[PDB]
C-alpha cells in the first residue's frame, strides 16, 4: 500500500516530463536540440520507501521490477507527441512520403 501511495505522488511531481518536447539521446552530444537522458525516458515514475528497519525487509534495489515494458513507453510517448503536434493544426499522418 505504501508503494501505491508513493507512486501516485511521484506521478504528480513529474508532470512537466510528460509534455516535454525533448529528444531522447543515449550518448551525450551537441546537436542544437534539447536532449533527454535515460533516467527521464519514462511515462510512469516511482519512489523509494522509507520506514524503520527497511534494510531487513526491502533489500538493496527493488525498483527494477516496476518499470513499464518498452512497448507501452513507445505507444504512450507517440500519443503524447501526437497531441502536442495537434495544437498547431498539424500531424504526420497527412504526408505519405514521410511514413
Amino acid at each position: 500500500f505504501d508503494q501505491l501511495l508513493a507512486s501516485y505522488l511521484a506521478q504528480l511531481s513529474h508532470i512537466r516530463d510528460l509534455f516535454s518536447w525533448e529528444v531522447d539521446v543515449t550518448q551525450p552530444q551537441q546537436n542544437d536540440y534539447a536532449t533527454r537522458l535515460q533516467e527521464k525516458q519514462r511515462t510512469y515514475f516511482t519512489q523509494k520507501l522509507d520506514f524503520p528497519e527497511i534494510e531487513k525487509i526491502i533489500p538493496d534495489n527493488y525498483l527494477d521490477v516496476l518499470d513499464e515494458a518498452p512497448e507501452t513507453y513507445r505507444d504512450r510517448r507517440n500519443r503524447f507527441l501526437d497531441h502536442l503536434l495537434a495544437r498547431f493544426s498539424e500531424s504526420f499522418s497527412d504526408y505519405v512520403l514521410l511514413n
Binding site: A86, R87, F88, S89, E90
Partner: protein, 50 residues
C-alpha cells in the same frame, strides 16, 4: 479549433490552407469552399482561365 488554426496561419493569407480556413471561420453560413491557385474568372464570358 479556432486557436489551433490561428497558431498556424498567423491571421494572414499566403497559401491554399490559409484562404480556406480564414473563410470558414468568419462566415458560418458557408458549407464548403475551394481555393484555386493562379486562376482567373471572366465575368462577361463566364469562362475560367486556368
Amino acid at each position: 479549433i479556432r486557436i489551433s488554426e490561428r497558431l498556424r496561419h498567423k491571421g494572414r493569407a499566403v497559401a491554399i490552407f490559409d484562404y480556406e480556413r480564414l473563410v470558414l471561420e468568419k462566415f458560418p453560413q458557408i458549407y464548403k469552399v475551394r481555393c484555386i491557385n493562379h486562376g482567373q474568372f471572366d465575368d462577361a464570358q463566364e469562362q475560367l482561365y486556368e
